[PDB]
Amino acid sequence: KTISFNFNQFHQNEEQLKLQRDARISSNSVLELTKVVNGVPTWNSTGRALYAKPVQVWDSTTGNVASFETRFSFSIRQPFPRPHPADGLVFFIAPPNTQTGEGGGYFGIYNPLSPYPFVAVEFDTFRNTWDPQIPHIGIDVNSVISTKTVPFTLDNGGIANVVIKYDASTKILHVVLVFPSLGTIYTIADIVDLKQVLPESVNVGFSAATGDPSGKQRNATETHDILSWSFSASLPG
Amino acid sequence: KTISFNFNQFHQNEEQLKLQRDARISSNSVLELTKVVNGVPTWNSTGRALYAKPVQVWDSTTGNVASFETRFSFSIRQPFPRPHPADGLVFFIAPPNTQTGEGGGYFGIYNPLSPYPFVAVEFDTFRNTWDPQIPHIGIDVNSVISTKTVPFTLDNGGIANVVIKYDASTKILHVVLVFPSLGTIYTIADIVDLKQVLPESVNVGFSAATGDPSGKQRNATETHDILSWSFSASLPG
Ligand SMILES: *[C@@H]1O[C@H](CO)[C@@H](O[C@@H]2O[C@H](CO)[C@@H](O)[C@H](O)[C@H]2NC(C)=O)[C@H](O[C@@H]2O[C@@H](C)[C@@H](O)[C@@H](O)[C@@H]2O)[C@H]1NC(C)=O
Ligand SMILES: *[C@@H]1O[C@H](CO)[C@@H](O[C@@H]2O[C@H](CO)[C@@H](O)[C@H](O)[C@H]2NC(C)=O)[C@H](O[C@@H]2O[C@@H](C)[C@@H](O)[C@@H](O)[C@@H]2O)[C@H]1NC(C)=O
Ligand SMILES: *[C@@H]1O[C@H](CO)[C@@H](O)[C@H](O[C@@H]2O[C@@H](C)[C@@H](O)[C@@H](O)[C@@H]2O)[C@H]1NC(C)=O
Ligand SMILES: *[C@@H]1O[C@H](CO)[C@@H](O)[C@H](O)[C@H]1NC(C)=O
Ligand SMILES: OC[C@H]1O[C@H](O)[C@H](O)[C@@H](O)[C@H]1O
Ligand SMILES: OC[C@H]1O[C@H](O)[C@H](O)[C@@H](O)[C@H]1O
Ligand SMILES: [Ca+2]
Ligand SMILES: [Ca+2]
Ligand SMILES: [Mn+2]
Ligand SMILES: [Mn+2]
Numbered sequence: 001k002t003i004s005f006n007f008n009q010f011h012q013n014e015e016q017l018k019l020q021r022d023a024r025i026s027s028n029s030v031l032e033l034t035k036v037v038n039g040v041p042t043w044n045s046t047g048r049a050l051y052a053k054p055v056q057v058w059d060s061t062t063g064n065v066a067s068f069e070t071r072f073s074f075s076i077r078q079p080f081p082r083p084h085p086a087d088g089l090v091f092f093i094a095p096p097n098t099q100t101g102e103g104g105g106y107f108g109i110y111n112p113l114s115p116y117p118f119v120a121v122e123f124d125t126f127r128n129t130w131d132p133q134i135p136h137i138g139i140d141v142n143s144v145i146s147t148k149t150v151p152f153t154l155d156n157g158g159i160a161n162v163v164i165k166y167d168a169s170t171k172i173l174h175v176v177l178v179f180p181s182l183g184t185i186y187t188i189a190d191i192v193d194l195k196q197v198l199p200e201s202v203n204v205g206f207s208a209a210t211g212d213p214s215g216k217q218r219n220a221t222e223t224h225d226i227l228s229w230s231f232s233a234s235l236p237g
Numbered sequence: 238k239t240i241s242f243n244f245n246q247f248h249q250n251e252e253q254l255k256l257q258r259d260a261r262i263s264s265n266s267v268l269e270l271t272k273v274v275n276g277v278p279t280w281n282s283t284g285r286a287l288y289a290k291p292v293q294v295w296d297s298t299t300g301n302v303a304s305f306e307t308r309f310s311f312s313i314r315q316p317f318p319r320p321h322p323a324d325g326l327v328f329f330i331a332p333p334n335t336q337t338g339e340g341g342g343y344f345g346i347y348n349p350l351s352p353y354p355f356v357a358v359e360f361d362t363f364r365n366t367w368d369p370q371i372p373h374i375g376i377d378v379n380s381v382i383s384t385k386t387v388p389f390t391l392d393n394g395g396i397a398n399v400v401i402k403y404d405a406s407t408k409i410l411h412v413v414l415v416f417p418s419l420g421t422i423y424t425i426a427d428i429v430d431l432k433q434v435l436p437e438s439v440n441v442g443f444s445a446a447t448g449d450p451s452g453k454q455r456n457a458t459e460t461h462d463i464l465s466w467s468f469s470a471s472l473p474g
Contacts, residue, residue: 071422148404163422174411174426185308185400189411189426 001237003055006230016052021100021108023047033089033208033224041079043211043221046103050205054096055233057202058195065168065195066235070204073227076125077157080219086126088135089208089224091164093194094118096203104212105131110144117142117197121164121175125154125222137177139190141197148190155179159227166194204231240292241469253289258337258345260284270326270445270461278316278458280448283340287442288468291333294439295432296474302405302432303472307441310464313362314394317456323363326445326461327377328401331355333440341449342368347381354379354434358401358412362391362459363448374414376427378434385427392416396464403431441468
């Protein structure tokens with residue numbers, strides 16, 4: 001049992017993708033998770049992009065957990081340095097058929113009213129009360145309060161290469177963040193037991209959010225674009 | 238307690254480094270682990286470079302183990318494609334005052350008639366009987382038979398950026414290998430309990446080796462140069 005897909009670019013109305021909320025595919029093939037009008041990112045925006053088909057991360061019959069690798073490129077342009085860009089984007093895994101959660105610092109994956117489990121890798125750009133300095137990469141399990149975090153310096157408008165890998169045998173989830181133009185490399189890892197937090201079948205995808213109106217700052221925004229995305233999972237059995 | 242050092246280049250007669258065997262610092266700031274005469278790598282060569290001062294990875298009094306991060310750049314030029322370049326270079330941690338071990342596939346860190354413990358990250362370029370395909374990154378603990386391995390494609394003569402990170406809390410050792418010219422990223426991780434394999438005080442450094450005479454192949458060689466090296470360790474004790 002080994003699923004696998006890759007998108008070297010995105011075509012309008014991708015039959016393979018499921019767009020939610022403000023997420024849209026631009027004319028030139030980029031996946032814009034958050035609203036951007038006339039080259040200008042907007043606040044009060046939230047969008048998700050899920051891979052249309054559910055993937056099986058573990059089998060209850062055998063007890064086996066899948067290993068997976070996912071690579072993608074993103075770009076975050078922060079047009080307004082003052083007072084503070086927000087909020088960031090995440091790659092996540094959650095039960096199938098979920099609805100967009102709260103925006104702002106919750107990236108659209110956390111729903112306080114009705115919480116669903118989820119594992120996510122965040123690229124946080126706004127410092128909430130529960131956050132260490134930003135920007136930072138964080139590993140989230142059922143909460144936006146990261147288990148592990150590492151700070152990084154964003155290449156404004158530049159391209160970012162990300163590699164997220166999970167080894168079922170060691171239960172190690174390690175992510176690598178590289179900004180090819182700056183030559184900088186950021187790494188973070190932690191132990192996560194998928195079998196323990198997620199159901200056998202899940203959805204994989206992205207979610208992003210810009211400044212929440214409650215913050216009263218229209219400048220709290222930025223773009224959250226995804227240029228490419230490949231995914232591979234291998235469930236032995 | 239925190240320790241750290243940085244080398245943006247290397248200077249001849251460096252007081253902070255301890256060179257062993259064939260290791261020498263070139264006129265233009267590169268650390269040549271293995272012998273190279275007039276722009277040509279030689280076989281039957283072995284060299285190590287250790288950081289002059291010992292570092293404390295764990296404290297017996299508190300039982301605490303240190304976390305550390307090390308970044309370095311290396312270059313391996315393989316002039317003779319046939320029959321097979323050899324053998325590779327490694328970054329290692331060992332008890333202080335050890336001497337260069339056997340060359341060839343032992344990289345100079347393993348001494349059969351007087352084994353000492355060690356944790357090492359290898360960049361193997363020659364396939365010994367105990368090796369999977371090469372080149373490959375491997376995590377070695379007391380043995381050249383890696384616990385975990387990952388294949389990679391070398392950028393012949395190109396520059397390679399490496400990031401090795403160890404988190405005491407999770408005991409996760411993760412290494413990242415990036416070839417900026419090719420834009421390729423390789424990642425590997427494993428669990429290693431330093432406190433369990435190493436003494437409180439250790440030496441950190443590099444070791445490399447070229448084809449062993451027993452192989453009767455003079456072309457079994459390559460360069461093993463290190464361009465830069467930074468280190469940082471944190472013992473909350
Ligand atoms: C919201 O983002 C705007 C775009 O960055 C800021 O406006 C720009 O602020 C500059 C100083 O930071 C100023 O030199 C520019 O002229 C101005 N751009 C224009 C013409 O709109 C804005 O900054 C505040 O509001 C503007 C109108 C000026 O009064 C600035 O002095 C203020 O700092 C950002 N708002 C906040 C709350 O920072
Ligand atoms: C050892 O490395 C040498 C450098 O590449 C090899 O010789 C080179 O072989 C090339 C094709 O194999 C040829 O184009 C080059 O002219 C030659 N370089 C020189 C000047 O020596 C060598 O290959 C062997 O020796 C040469 C002379 C030929 O007889 C080949 O057929 C041989 O394979 C390499 N030897 C080994 C052990 O592979
Ligand atoms: C944020 O986006 C939502 C859509 O998800 C808009 O409805 C919000 O507009 C505000 O609230 C609505 C209900 C209506 O009262 C409108 O006039 C308001 O502006 C929008 N929030 C803001 C502050 O723009
Ligand atoms: C290999 O090197 C050692 C010492 O560096 C030397 O004594 C020996 O003669 C060399 N062997 C060959 C065949 O070059
Ligand atoms: O002003 C922006 C700011 O608004 C609120 O404080 C949200 O909780 C933050 O995450 C951020 O969106
Ligand atoms: O020919 C080169 C080859 O020689 C022997 O087999 C060594 O054990 C190897 O590590 C390598 O040096
Ligand atoms: Ca935040
Ligand atoms: Ca080998
Ligand atoms: Mn955060
Ligand atoms: Mn090996």
